[PDB]
Amino acid sequence: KLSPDAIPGKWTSQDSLLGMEFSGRDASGKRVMGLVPAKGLATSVLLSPDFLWDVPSNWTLEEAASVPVVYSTAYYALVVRGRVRPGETLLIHSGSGGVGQAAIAIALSLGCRVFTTVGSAEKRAYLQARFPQLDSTSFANSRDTSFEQHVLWHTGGKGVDLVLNSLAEEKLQASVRCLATHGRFLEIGKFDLSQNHPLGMAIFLKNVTFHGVLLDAFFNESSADWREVWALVQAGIRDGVVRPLKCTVFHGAQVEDAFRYMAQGKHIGKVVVQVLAEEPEAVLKGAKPKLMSAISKTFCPAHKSYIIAGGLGGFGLELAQWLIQRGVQKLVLTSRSGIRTGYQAKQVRRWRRQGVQVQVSTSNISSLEGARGLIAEAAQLGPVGGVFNLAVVLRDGLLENQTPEFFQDVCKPKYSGTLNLDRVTREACPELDYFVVFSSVSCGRGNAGQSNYGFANSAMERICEKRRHEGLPGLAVQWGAIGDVSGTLPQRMASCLEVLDLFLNQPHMVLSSFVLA
C-alpha cells in the first residue's frame, strides 16, 4: 500500500526499508536500543551513536525493542511541539496502540486529564488495568465518530486543549471540532495530508494551532534538534515515566507469521521479531550474530576498483549503474571514442555527483600493453575488484561476403581482449573476484550471417571455462537480446540485470538467458 519512494531520504532501487527500531548488544557488547530510518529489521544495523540509548539493567532486550519509536514520537508530539503543561486536557486517539500508550503514559505523569478512544472492549479493559489513574469517563469509541459528543459533554462544551490525532478524514474533521480556545492539534497520520483533503480555516478564529508532526525529519536533518528529544526520552527512562509496552515474540524464522498477525489487527502493544536470543551476561565481549542462511545477493566493497570494457555502450552504462547501486564507488569505463553522446555525459555527471570516482580510459584491451595500462590505472583508485568485458564490434554478412579482416576486427576486442585481460589479471590482480564476459546467443544456438561473432563469443566462453578450472573466477553469460538499450523477443533491462545477479551468484562456468517468442 505504501510505495518505498514515499519514505524520506536517499534509498537504493534494490533494498528493503522494513523496521525502524531494534535492541541488541553494541560492538563492545553494551546492550543498546536504537532508532533507524529503515533497514532496522536485520541481523545487523549500521547506525549513528546519537540514536542509541543504554538499556536499564532491570529491562530486558525483549522489552526495550518497543520503547524507542513510540516514546520518541510521543515526546516529540507533546512536549516539543504541543508544549503540554500540567493540568491540561488531552484527547489521545487509539489509546491501545503503541503511540497512544506512550502519549497516555507521558500525559499522566504531568498530571493532565486524558480522553482516549479504543476500538473494542478488550482494549478498553486492558487500558483501564494498565493505567489505574485513568477513569471510565476517559474512554470513548474510535471507529465511530461518537467520541465528539462524549468529549464535548464531559469537558462541559469547552473542548480538549491538546489533540493527538491519527484517524481518517471524517474522524479527523470530527476531532478538530473538539479543540478548545487556544487548542493545539497534533496530526501524526498521513492519509488526509497525502490526499490534500481541505481544512476549513474558520477553526483558526480561535487561537487553535495545527501541527504537522513527522519524525522522519530528524533522521534527515536537524540533529541539533533531535538531541532534545533524545534527552527527553533518556530523562523519561531514568525517571520512571517510560515503560516498555507489551510484546509478542515471533522467532526469526517466523517473520511472515509476525507480519500476518500484525496485519490481522488484533494485536495490543508491539510485535517484535526475536532475531537472536539474549545471553545471560550483562556485557559480552563478542556480540557477533550467529550465522544465518539467507538468499545470496551481490554487493561490492568500496575500497575495491571495478573495470568495464566498452562500458560507455548501451549495456555498459546500465551495468555500471547497477554496480553503483551495489556500492562500487570506483569505476573505470573503457571506450576508444570517449564521451561523445549526451546521455553518456549525463550519466557520468550524475555518478560523479554522488561521489563515485568514475574514470574514462580510452585504453584498448586488445593490446597487452593496453590491458596492462587499463589494469594499472584502475589499481590507482584501489585494488581491482572485477573486470567486465562488454566490448563488441560486429561485421555482419554471409561467409562469401566475409573477409579475414572482418573476422580479425570482430575478434580483436572480445577474443584478444579477453586473453589480455585474463593474462594481466592473473599476473597482477590477486584481489580480483569477478571476471565476467558477455557472450551472445548467436554463438552456440546459431545464427545467420554472424560466423565471426559466433567465433569471438565461443573463444570468450572457452577462456572463461579454462579460468574456472584453475580456481580463478570467470563467468560467461549469453543473452538472446536486450530491448531497452533468432526467434527470441528482446529482453527488458530490469529482467536482464536480475538474471545477471542470479548468474553471478551461481557456480556454473557458462550460462545463458533469453525470452522465447
Binding site: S3, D5, A6, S13, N196, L489, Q491, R492, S495, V515
Partner: protein, 68 residues
C-alpha cells in the same frame, strides 16, 4: 527512480494567441516551441502554456505477465 504520474496541478494558464506568437520554424517545415522548466519556482513554461505546482505521485509500476 520509478514511474511517477501526475496527481495534482495547482494552476495552468493557456493562451492560444501567445502560443501562435511563440512558435518558430526550424530548417524543416516542422514547428517547435521552446520549453523551460524551473524546479525552484515549480513552473513549466512552453510556448503559450504555463504549468505550475505539478505534483507527481509514485505509481505501483507493477505489470502483470512479466517476461519469463
Amino acid at each position: 527512480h520509478g514511474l511517477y504520474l501526475p496527481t495534482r496541478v495547482t494552476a495552468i494558464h493557456i493562451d492560444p494567441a501567445t502560443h501562435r506568437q511563440k512558435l518558430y520554424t526550424l530548417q524543416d517545415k516542422a514547428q517547435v516551441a521552446d520549453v523551460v522548466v524551473s524546479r525552484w519556482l515549480r513552473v513549466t513554461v512552453a510556448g503559450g502554456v504555463h504549468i505550475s505546482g505539478l505534483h507527481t505521485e509514485s505509481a505501483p509500476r507493477r505489470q502483470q505477465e512479466q517476461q519469463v
